[PDB]
Amino acid sequence: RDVHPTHYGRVCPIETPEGPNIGLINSLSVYAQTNEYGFLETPYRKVTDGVVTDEIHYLSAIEEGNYVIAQANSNLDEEGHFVEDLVTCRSKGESSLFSRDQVDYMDVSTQQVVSVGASLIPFLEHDDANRALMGANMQRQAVPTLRAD
Amino acid sequence: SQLKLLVTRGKEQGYLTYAEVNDHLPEDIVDSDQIEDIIQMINDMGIQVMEEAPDADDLMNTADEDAAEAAAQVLSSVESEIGRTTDPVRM
Amino acid sequence: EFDAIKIALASPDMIRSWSFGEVKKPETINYRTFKPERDGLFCARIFGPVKDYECLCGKYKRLKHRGVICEKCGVEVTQTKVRRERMGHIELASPTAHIWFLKSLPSRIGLLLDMPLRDIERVLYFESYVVIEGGMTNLERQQILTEEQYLDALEEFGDEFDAKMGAEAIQALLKSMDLEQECEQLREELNETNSETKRKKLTKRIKLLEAFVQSGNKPEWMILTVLPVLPPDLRPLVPLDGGRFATSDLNDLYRRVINRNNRLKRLLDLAAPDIIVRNEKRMLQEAVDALLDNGRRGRAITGSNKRPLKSLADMIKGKQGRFRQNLLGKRVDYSGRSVITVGPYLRLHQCGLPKKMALELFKPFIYGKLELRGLATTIKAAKKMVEREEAVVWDILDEVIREHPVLLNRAPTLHRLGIQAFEPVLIEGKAIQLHPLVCAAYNADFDGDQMAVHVPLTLEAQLEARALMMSTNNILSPANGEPIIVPSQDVVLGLYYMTRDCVNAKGEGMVLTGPKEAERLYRSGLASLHARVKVRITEYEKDANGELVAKTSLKDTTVGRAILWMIVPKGLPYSIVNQALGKKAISKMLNTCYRILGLKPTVIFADQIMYTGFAYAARSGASVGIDDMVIPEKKHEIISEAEAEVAEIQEQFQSGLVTAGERYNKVIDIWAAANDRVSKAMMDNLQTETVINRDGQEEKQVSFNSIYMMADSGARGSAAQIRQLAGMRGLMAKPDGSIIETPITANFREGLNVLQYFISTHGARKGLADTALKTANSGYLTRRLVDVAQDLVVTEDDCGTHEGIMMTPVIEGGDVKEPLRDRVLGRVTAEDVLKPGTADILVPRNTLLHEQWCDLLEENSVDAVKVRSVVSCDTDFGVCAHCYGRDLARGHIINKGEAIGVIAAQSIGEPGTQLTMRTFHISSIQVKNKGSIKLSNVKSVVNSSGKLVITSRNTELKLIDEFGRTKESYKVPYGAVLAKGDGEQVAGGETVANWDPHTMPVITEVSGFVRFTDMIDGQTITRQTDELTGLSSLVVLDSAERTAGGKDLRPALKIVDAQGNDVLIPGTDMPAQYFLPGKAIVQLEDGVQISSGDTLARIPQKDITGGLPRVADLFEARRPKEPAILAEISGIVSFGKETKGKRRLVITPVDGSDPYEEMIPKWRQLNVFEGERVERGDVISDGPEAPHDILRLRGVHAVTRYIVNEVQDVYRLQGVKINDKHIEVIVRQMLRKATIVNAGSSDFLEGEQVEYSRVKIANRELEANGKVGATYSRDLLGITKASLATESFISAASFQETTRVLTEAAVAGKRDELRGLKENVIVGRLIPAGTGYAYHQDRMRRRAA
Amino acid sequence: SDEADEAYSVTEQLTMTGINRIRQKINAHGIPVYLCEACGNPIPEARRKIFPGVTLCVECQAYQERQRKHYA
Amino acid sequence: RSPGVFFDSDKGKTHSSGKVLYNARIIPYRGSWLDFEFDPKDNLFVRIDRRRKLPATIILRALNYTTEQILDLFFEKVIFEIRDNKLQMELVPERLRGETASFDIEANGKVYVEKGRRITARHIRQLEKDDVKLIEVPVEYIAGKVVAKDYIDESTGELICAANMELSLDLLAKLSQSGHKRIETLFTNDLDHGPYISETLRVDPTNDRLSALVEIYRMMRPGEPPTREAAESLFENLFFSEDRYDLSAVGRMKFNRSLLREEIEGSGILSKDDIIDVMKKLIDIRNGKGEVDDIDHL
Ligand SMILES: [Mg+2]
Ligand SMILES: [Zn+2]
Ligand SMILES: [Zn+2]
Ligand SMILES: [Zn+2]
Structure with missing residues (x-):
């Protein structure tokens, strides 16, 4: 019934039907694919020693907990070098600060944590979580109008 | 009679799993229907044999009270027999 | 019409009278012409005809033959309603055991015969034999046998030997037994011989036997001979669409029974070998047993759908039987539902109602009125007129609607204000516009909540609704007299914005001729709504006897307050509106108006508050903008310093100066402190930040930041939510309760990035999940509590008693947690309230303590009143009005007839929804107030040090001031070194008790010689020597170390006097030889006399739950296995045998029988000295005290005070307000079974449990008669056990x-x-x-x- | 009210009575002890400076917490 | 939920004390389950498909393992020597990291730690930087240990002391008469390397492979007479048949990943390697190096 620190980029953390079955009908995130086995995987930019390459790399859930993944909102100096020394990352569940030369992967784009429903909300980052949940659920019931605007 | 202290275990816990009621059974029951009937007799007096850990934080006692000693008698007796007297077909 | 309902066995005779003919064949219908086939499960001639007044022949199709039975095919020309009340019997070829009396646990054929269930189950399924009057040869009556021994003893005897099997045997047994015979025989052989389990079970059996004799039953009617069949229409075979019939399982089951019954009959005709007929009998028995209660014993027969098909019990019993759904909750006519909207234009006694809904719910009313006014000839013409909806139909509708109030109800009816009744204002629309103030009661809001309108038909119903349920008649919460009509959010903010004041607004300073001039300026535009001003107001007061005397003055107010003054009724001071009117002030305004001007002016005044509030919140234009969520500017500094703190702790961790858990704790600690600091920075920046200037420089006033206004008016919001808008939103928790170590240091005004948002998601979804569950299990407490307390009703005006309880201010830990004015309000005083010097009888002894009397109480500073309780009433099967109090939902007093049990369960289950669902947790005695000492339960000694060391146990210090009322509570620990004495003068700043928790004295009464009497060093002593001080300590050890030389001996530290004789302790024949427990810090060894109460021997060394489930357990009355062991009787204590775990402790009276032993498990630290003459209802083990013990020792009043305090504290820690009558009535419903201390003159078994009213009526009847009646022992059961034992069976x-x-x-x-x-x-x-x-x-x- | 309005208070009680027990494990009193109450080692000055009133050396505290972690 | 091996805790909700139990299921895509549940007294109990619980090492014995190599698998060794004077011991200093010495830790003739001391990291560095390679302690330090393997007489072929034997003074007494110099006890600490399989041996009713298969068959389908190779057939088809039991390829991936196997794919049938790796990972989760699985973990 609840979210785990490996839902990141695989299952929407906010978009669920509130009511009787919360967290059982979790909806898929934007870039989430399924592994060759059946496991969900999400992309990550391969970041070698200090440069964030634009070759992407689909990590599954069992593997992502053995890498220092970057943060989607991490600046870059026109070449793929983080313009901070330390950089926000999430190594094993607990997020943290990690030095420049430790990140193993970066995130593909910042909408990769939320589902298609909860990505049409502007200013999602200024809302209570449950408010965005109710918001996605109620966007999913909108009746088409005469003149769609 | 490990059955008899199985009953007291299920009481002093307030619940029984299928694990416990598979542990403290008679080792000689092969006809599953006997297991069915006896777990029903257990639940009839308390305590209800759910299949897992829960009742952890559910503090709700409809199992009073004359049924308790009678059902304990029936359980203590089920070992004295081997069945079945419940299926007409097999009889 | 009728009266009581009798249930009992039914003979075969009575069953044959119930029927209208026997059902022989198993066929239902005729499959091509679907006439019900004779004479089977749906027989026209047995169970009535199929068409109204038409026989199945076809020959008789007119009413003129109504009553003749067609000679062609037997049917009786009547109504096919008759096809729902006839029954038919099935002649069983062999008897059959009714599975209910067979396998109910306890088996009634079993313990009516005293035969084990296994043996009857053997004889029934023919695996055995049973003798019945086995001649005068060898075998007792109940003797089981088998095939083998049977055929054997038959060689012995062909006659004088009766061993049957199957239901025939059990029947010949049941009939051959003599109830009076065995009952009196059990009488004889229980009287002349008595043994514990023997008398237990045998008197149980004789109870059952004489019950069977007293009834009209017969012992063998438990064994079916004729079987009845339900009427067809109750088990129909309805034709669905497409020639695909639908039936109920009962037709399948009746087919299964009739088939095997007929087959058995044919077997018996053929004279078959008894193997096959045995199998047939067993098959028929399984058929009947699956027809009566399928799934009971033998793996229920499954229908054709794979499914275990229902039987008569499943149509009765369980969650789905009759008794539960259609017998309690039904779909009801004249009813509709729709979406409620606001409709502020209303009064609070009306509700909008759409013309469509109104015209449809009220059809027969309009029909009758249109044909009464002559607007329509017939009723058919009236239906046509309405379905055309003509111009006069609407007027006739509004004529009908006028005084007919309709009931409005919402979905989760949590309490009795969930159903109210309003007068309908027809509303040209489609939504039930519900008045705003009522949404508090209904728990409603306008985001889609549907409400259901019911119409009351009769005249008694309209008078109930208009007199008992009108929305203007319930303005008080029935949980507590505080009103449920408090304005909520638009209106408190409008009222707040009105009654405020800038520091320099328009039109400031001017003086006004009154409130009318205030509005004449404001609407004109010459004065801001809050610009301080002097205005002349004339406020009234009801000081005299109903005389509202006026007093006028020039008050210093604002334009807003004086404009709002025009809506206040007469008898209310101007001080009520000269404040800033948040939600609390705007609630207590309504509350004072109720306490003064009664109810009508309060409903009018509440409507006026709402109107003026909406109007001036509209005029205020009070929006919210993103520029209103002002972040502080000292925020980045606070966050930076907290980050430096966590970096330094992490650095210490990297240098091995701390564990992991402690680095984590310090991180969470510094983050909590930084979060509090940012909350404070923002609130300080935001509350006063309006900085204005008048005739000069500058002056900071409270802010007008609209977010602050809505948070500070109590309109919507609080410190925390703006902490999340402006400050940082803190530490977010994952659902286990373990807080994440890095906090979101941002707000919602600045975004959260992806990680911080993903972190808030955890706790957010946890909270969402626990409200989506907390709702679905909503009325479980209220429902569980009305099962126990439903049948309770205020049934008498006064029971004339002087029992009661001593209501007192609650003072726990420090100071008062609630005054006496609350806990006494509107309860009837049991005995007279005298003044402090007692001076006269002040309060008479049957006075309804309303607000005047609460004032007249606190104006003499009383802190204990004997008030009548419900639980200590005297009336049987009810409660007298006076010993309950006043109906806090109506104000005046309880009436003869209020079902106070239901409203108590509701008043505890409704506020049970504001309590969290999952459960929930949490040096010296320095004076801090001005007052004077008073030690309670004190037995001390003034040692040579001049200090005080109290030798008692229950000695604690309360603070009593100039008036006498209790000021503060504190406990005085044992040997708490008191610098003061007792009762003398004190002030705040002189620590009254200094005591060291390291040591618990053995304080002597005498400054005498030490003496180690009965102290064997090495066998009763341990040779301790602390070489720090070099301390010669002959310490005493427990009974867990030393040898058997002094094992159950007693190390006695005694103070004798300075010549060598033992100093007797004053009062008894024991010198002061304090026998030593183990583990004692007995520093001084013998030969050193010391002060009167030094620590010669020194003993070595408030969590509260809060869930609603804590309430459920508080009511279930469970015995926590860490229970304080009270003292079964006052008197001299003494120990006994040791080292069993169960160690002996016994208390001897001066007068009564001494020997009462009790086995204290040695896991618990004992807490009474060896030779202390103990009180009654004391404590030895300490911790949870089981309420059963509190009842059995201290009495009923003590257990009620205990449970009331437990529940009240669980409700008070969140601030939920609930009265005491409700917990008291539920507690009375708890202790309503008693058992007798002496069987006495009455007709009761000794250890039998009967309802306490039964005992108390019989004993009153007996001591009114010649004898003296039962000596009862009150008992206490949980709600879940008391609501099981009840009197009715339909209930x-x-x-x-x-x-x-x-x-x-x-x-x-x-x-x-x-x-x-x-x-x-x-x-x-x-x-x-x-x-x-x-x-x-x-x-x-x-x-x- | 609504789903989110009560869910807020459920989460808020959760967070508050989760902060408070982690913050109550913190020692705020003052009584220097100088000797780990299990092993008698001298608690160094610095590890007594961070948490005043700490009555265990870091080694014994790590042991006791490792033991706590399995609920023994 | 995918096939594979899962480790869960059942945290503080069955026992009164609150101690957690740390079971370790093995669910295959098709076949028979296998569960490994501790008990409140820290006893490994393997229960094949959900019926009655059995002691742990009975399945190991059915794998044609006996007690000595079982202890060699599930433990480290400690080697006491009769150094001509009251049984002095082999020592490596990092083992002791968390000890409370019942003696005077001394080498070079030089007391490293006074007796009674909770063994410190300080004395750790002292030992190895000074490299203590054999210590001497009193005899009641070996008085309560357990012997690793078998021990039988050179006199009459009689048992010195059985494998997995609690120690005493007479046991070392008879070892001296046997001339034994290698006391193989185990390294069991309350904190990290706890004794669990040892006590589970103590509770094991059976002693050899045939007894184990007898017990297993009596549990699987009671009533029928057992038989040596009949029980052998039942067991070796329960989790070793290509026909019956199979963790599919995803099951094998989850398995070889949940134990940190270098490979990623293999058989569809279990092995001694697999069940022993499972038991090891379980007891090392109990020790405190590892973590139970979150169920919702995607
Ligand atoms: Mg709603
Ligand atoms: Zn006819
Ligand atoms: Zn009364
Ligand atoms: Zn230590």
Whole structure:
């Protein structure tokens, strides 16, 4: 019934039907694919020693907990070098600060944590979580109008 | 009679799993229907044999009270027999 | 019409009278012409005809033959309603054991015969034999046998030997037994011989036997001979669409029974070998047993759908039987639902109602009125007129609607204000516009919540609704007299914005001729709504006897307050509106108006508050903008310093100066402190930040930041939510309760990035999940509590008693947690309240302590009143009005007829929804107030140090001031070194007790010689020597170390005097030889006399839960296994045998019988000295005290005070307000079973449990008679156990196990008298509670007359 | 009210009575002890400076917490 | 939920004390389950498909393992020597990291730690930087240990002391008469390397492979007479048949990943390697190096 620190980029953390079955009908995130086995995987930019390459790399859930993944909102100096020394990352569940030369992967784009429903909300980052949940659920019931605007 | 202290275990816990009621059974029951009937007799007096850990934080006692000693008698007796007297077909 | 309902066995004779002919064949219909086939499961001639007044022949199709039975095919020309009341019998070829009396646990054929269930189950399924009057040869009557021994003893005897098998045997047994015979034989051989389990079970059996004799039953009617069949229309075979019939399983089951019955009959005709007929009998028995209660014993027969098909019990018993859904909750006519909207234009006694809804719910009213006014000739013409909806139909509608109030109800009816009744204002629309103030009660809001309107038809119903349920009649929460009409959010913010004041607004300073001039300026535009001003207001007061005397003055107010003054009624001071009017002030305004001007002016005034509030919140234009969520500017500094803190702790961790858990704790600690600091920075920046200037420089006033206004008016919001808008939103928790170590240091005004948002998601979804579950399990507490307390009703005006309880201010830990004015308000005083010097009888002894009397109490500073309680009433089967109090939902007093049990359960289950669902947790005695000492339960010694060391146990210090009332509570620990004495003068700053928790004295009374009497060093002593001080300590050890040389000996540290004789302790024949427990810090070794109460021997060394489930357990009355062991009797304590775990402790009286032993498990640290003469109802083990013990020792009043305090504290830690009558009435419903201390002159078994009213009526009847009656012992059961044992069976079979209650009430011939509230709802008569109380009374005097 | 309005208070009680027990494990009193109450080692000055009133050396505290972690 | 091996805790909700139990299921895509449940007294109990619980090492014995190599698998060794004077011991200093010495830790003739001391990291560095390679302690330090393997007489072929034997003074007494110099006890600490399989041996009713298969068959389908190779057949088809039991390829991936196997794919049938790796990972989760699985973990 609840979210785990490996839902990141695989299952929407906010978009669920509130009511009787919360967290059982979790909806898929934007870039989430399924592994060759059946496991969900999400992309990550391969970041070698200090440069964030634009070759992407689909990590599954069992593997992502053995890498220092970057943060989607991490600046870059026109070449793929983080313009901070330390950089926000999430190594094993607990997020943290990690030095420049430790990140193993970066995130593909910042909408990769939320589902298609909860990505049409502007200013999602200024809302209570449950408010965005109710918001996605109620966007999913909108009746088409005469003149769609 | 490990059955008899199985009953007291299920009481002093307030619940029984299928694990416990598979542990403290008679080792000689092969006809599953006997297991069915006896777990029903257990639940009839308390305590209800759910299949897992829960009742952890559910503090709700409809199992009073004359049924308790009678059902304990029936359980203590089920070992004295081997069945079945419940299926007409097999009889 | 009728009266009590009798249930019992049914003979075969009575069953043959019930029927209208026997069903022989198993066929239902005729498959091509679907006439019900004769004469089977749907027989026209047995179970009535299929068409109204038409026989199945076709020959008789007119009413003119109504009543003749067609000679061609036998049917009786009648109504096919008759096809729902006839029954038919099935002649069983062999007898059959009724599975209910067979396998109910306890088996009634079993313990009516005293035969084990296994043996009857053997004889039934023919695996055995059983003798019945086995001649005068060898075998007792009940003797089982088998095939083998049977055929053997038959060689012995062909006659004088009767061993049957199967239901024939059990029947010949049941009939051959003699109830009077075995009952009196058990009498004899239980009288002349008594043994514990023997007398237990045998007197149980004789109870059952004489119950069977007292009833009209017969012992063998448990064994079916004729079987009845339900009427067809109750088990129909309805034709669905497409020639695909639908039936109920009962047709399949009846087919299965009739088939095997016929097959058995044919076998018996053929004279088959008894193997096959045995299998046939067993098959028929399984058929009947699956027809009666399928799934009971033998793996229920499954229908054609794979499914275990239902039987008669499953149509009765369980969650789905009759008793539960259609017998309690039904779909009801004249009813509709729709979406509620606001409609502020209303009064609070009306509700909008759409013309479509109104015209449709009110059809027969309009029809009758259109044909009464002549607007329509017939009723058919009236229907046509309405369905065309003509211009006069609407006017006739508005004529009908006028005074007919409609009931409005919402989905989760959590309490009795969930149903109210309004007058309908027709509303050209489609939404039920519900008045705003009422949404508090209904718990409603306008985001889609549907409400359901019901119409009351009769005149008694309209008068109930208009007199008992109108929305203007319930402005007080029935949980507590505080009103439920408090304005919520638009209106408190409008009222707040009005009654405020800038520091320099328009039109400031000017003085006004009154409030009318205030509005004449404001609307004109010459004064801001809050610009301070002097205005002349004339406020009234009801100081005299109903004389509202005016007093005028020039008050210093604002334009807003004076404009709002025009809506306040007369008798209210201007001080009520000269404040800033948040939500609390705007609630207590309504509250004072109720306490002064009664109810009508309060409803009018509340409507006026709402109108003026909406109007001036509209005029305020008070929006919210993103520029209003002002971040502080010292935020980045606070966050930076907290980050430096966590970096330094992490650095210390990297240098091995801390564990992991402690680095984590310090991180969470510094983050909590930084979060609090940012909250404070923002609130300081935001509350006063309006900085204005008048005739000069500058001056900071409270802010007008609209977010702050809505948070500070109590309109919407608080410190925390703006902490999340402006400050940082703190530490977010994952759902286990373990807080994440990095906090979101941002707000919602600045975004959260992806990680911080993903972190808030955890706790957010946890909270969402726990409200989506907390709702679905909503009325479980209220429902569980009305099962126990439903049948309770205020049934007498006064019971004339002087019992009661001593209501007192609650003072726990420090100071008062609630005054006496609350806990006494509107309860009847039991005995006279005298003044402090007692001076006269001040408060008479039957005075309804309303607000004047609460004032007149606190104006003499009383802190203890003997108030009548519900639980200590005297009336049987009810409660007298006075010993309950006043109906806090109506104000005046309880009436004869209020079903206070239901409203108590509701008043505890409603506020139970504001308590969290999952459960929940949490040096010296320095004076801090001005007052004077008072030590309670004190027995001390003033040692040579001049200090005080109290030798008692229950000694604690309370603070009593100039008036006498208790000021503060504190406990005085044992040997708490008191610098003061007792009762003398004190001030705040002189620590009254200094005591060291390291040591618990053995304080002597005498400054005498030490003496180690009975102290064997090495066998009763341990040779301790602390070489720090070099301390010669002959310490005493427990009974867990030393040898058997002094094992149960007693190390006695005694103070004798300075010549060598033992100093007797003053009062008894024991010198002061304090026998030593183990582990004692007995520093001083012998030969050193010391002060009167030094620590010669020194003993070595408030969590509260809060869930609603803590309430459920508080009521279930469970014995926590860490229970304080009270003292079964006052008197000299003493120990005994040791080292069993169960160690002996016994208390001897001066007078009574001494020997009472109790085995204290040695896991618990004992807490009473060896030779202290102990009180009654003391404590030895300390911790949880089981309430059962509190009852059995301290009495009823002590257990009620305990449970009331437990529940009240669980509700008070969140601030939920609930009265005491409710917990008291539920507690009275808890202790309503008693058992007798002496069987006495009455007709009661010794250890039998009977309802306390039964004992107390019989004993009153007996001591009014010659003898003296039973000496009872009150008992206490939980709600879940007390609501099981109840008197009716129609009631207690609705919600209990149906089969067990029905079988017991059947065997016992228990005729139910409809005098409860569940029964009279099931049967469908008037409840005895409310309006129906009068009818039930006058019908109770019709009979008995 | 609504789903989110009560869910807020459920989460808020959760967070508050989760902060408070982690913050109550913190020692705020003052009584220097100088000797780990299990092993008698001298608690160094610095590890007594961070948490005043700490009555265990870091080694014994790590042991006791490792033991706590399995609920023994 | 995918096939594979899962480790869960059942945290503080069955026992009264609150101690957690740390079971370790093995669910295959098709076949028979296998569960490994501790008990409140820290006893490994393997229960094949959900019926009655059995002691742990009975399945190991059915794998044709006996007690000595079982202890060699599930433990480290400690080697006491009769150094001509009251049984002095082999020592490596990092083992002791968390000890409370019942003696005077001394080498070079030099007391490293006074007796009674909770063994410190300080004395750790002292030992190895000074490299203590054999210590001497009193005899009641070996008085309560357990012997690793078998021990039988050179006199009459009689048992010195059985494998997995609690120690005493007479046991070392008879070892001296046997001339034994290698006391193989185990390294069991309350904190990290706890004794669990040892006590589970103590509770094991059976002693050899045939007894184990007898017990297993009596549990699987009771009533029928057992038989040596009949029980052998039942067991070796229960989790070793290509026909019956199979963790599919995803099951094998989850398995070889949940134990940190270098490979990623293999058989569809279990092995001694697999069940022993499972038991090891379980007891090392109990020790405190590892973590139970979150169920919702995607
Ligand atoms: Mg709503
Ligand atoms: Zn006819
Ligand atoms: Zn009364
Ligand atoms: Zn230590």
